[PDB]
Each structure stands twice: as C-alpha cells, then as structure tokens.
C-alpha cells in the first residue's frame, strides 16, 4: 500500500496506506 505524498516539487518520498 504505497501512495503519493498528498506535485510542484520533486523528490518527495512516497507514504504508506
């Protein structure tokens, strides 16, 4: 369960659900 950080930057880690 891997999703986006909740797009105007680059390199943000993904997060768990």
């Amino acid at each position: 369960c891997k999703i986006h950080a909740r797009f105007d930057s680059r390199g943000n880690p993904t997060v768990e659900c």
Partner: antibody
Amino acid sequence: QVQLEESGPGLVRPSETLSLSCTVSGFPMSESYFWGWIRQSPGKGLEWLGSVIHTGTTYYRPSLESRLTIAMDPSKNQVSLSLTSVTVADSAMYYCVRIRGGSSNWLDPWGPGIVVTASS
Amino acid sequence: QSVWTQPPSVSAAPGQKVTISCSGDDSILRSAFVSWYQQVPGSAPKLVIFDDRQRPSGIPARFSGSNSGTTATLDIAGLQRGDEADYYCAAWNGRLSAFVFGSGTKLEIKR
C-alpha cells in the same frame, strides 16, 4: 495531447555555450508538471540534466549545476537549456520531456531529440 | 548510486517472458516510484510503466512492473518481434537529490 520539439545548433565549439529550446504545444505550461532535459551520448545511456516548473523551482544534475540553466517562458510556450563551457564530452542526443514530479517523477512525452556535437 | 544496476542483455523467443531487474543500494527504492522506458533504436524513449506498476493508456497488459524496495522489475510477457529495444528504469534518488536512470538492458528476440 502534449507536443514537444527541440531546436538549436547541431555543432558547438569547445568552451562556448550550448543553447537549446523546446516548443511545447497543445498543453498548458501553468499546470503542475515540470519541463526538463535528458541526454544520451552515442552508444551509451540516459542522463537527466534537470527540470523547471512555472513557479520557478528548478532541479539540476549535481555534477552539471555550475554550468546548466534550465528555464521556461509559458507565454511563448518554450523551455530552454543553456550549458556553459562545453566540452567534447557534452556531445549527445538532447531530449525535452514533460515530467510529473512529486513522488512520481515519470517522463511522458519525450521530444524526437536533437543531435549535438561539441568539436573544433 | 548515481546509476541503477541493470543486466546488460536478455534474450527470448516470441511468446515467451523476460524479466529485467533494476537495483540500488540497500532499500533506496522503498519510498520512490520507479518508471520504465522502451527505446527502439533510432527513436526517443517511450514510457511503459510508471509509479512502480501502472501502465499508460495504450501500453498492453503484458508489460508489468514491481518494486520490492531493494530491486524493481519489468516483466515483458508474450514477447513480440517489435519488443526489441533497450529498456531503462528510473527513479528519484533521495540520498543524492537527483533523478537517476538505470544502465539499460538490451532485449534480443530469438528466431
């Protein structure tokens, strides 16, 4: 759908500045997407150079950051590359790309590419 | 690493399946989304997988992806002669603060 086309010189002299431009048509540059540049040396792999978004935020390859400027002009519908103090190792195919940033960092679409040789 | 590790080549007959790996240091791919690119010689790269396992519209379901955190994989099933190409993985590297490509894998189709 997004349309990309690179333009610029095919031949640049050592120590001069390489200037490329990319025309972006059929898509708004003020949406939440980066615009960037990738290169590929003959017979070798893909190398990310950097990218820019309409807010002004920019990311560069650490080894090239002193020589590279990537910028955009959303009225003209263009993204630019400027690589100073070129060397023979800068010879490559250069591609413009649309990038979905954040945690995604996917590249779609790509321009057809422009061949650039740095030589005397 | 500044380039992800991929095998130089893979080879199989039409109708068969290949898997192509993409590795970094320890679990550096754990909190990054991996994408894959198909480059047919003479053309620009084309996105085939994004966000580890998703396919763009138009890409067939026989391309699939996974990311275990240590290693990401592209599977190509039901190989067709037009699948011959160089394949590259890519992902943000948070330790370097830079976008990184894999070293590339050439797919040869047998006949």
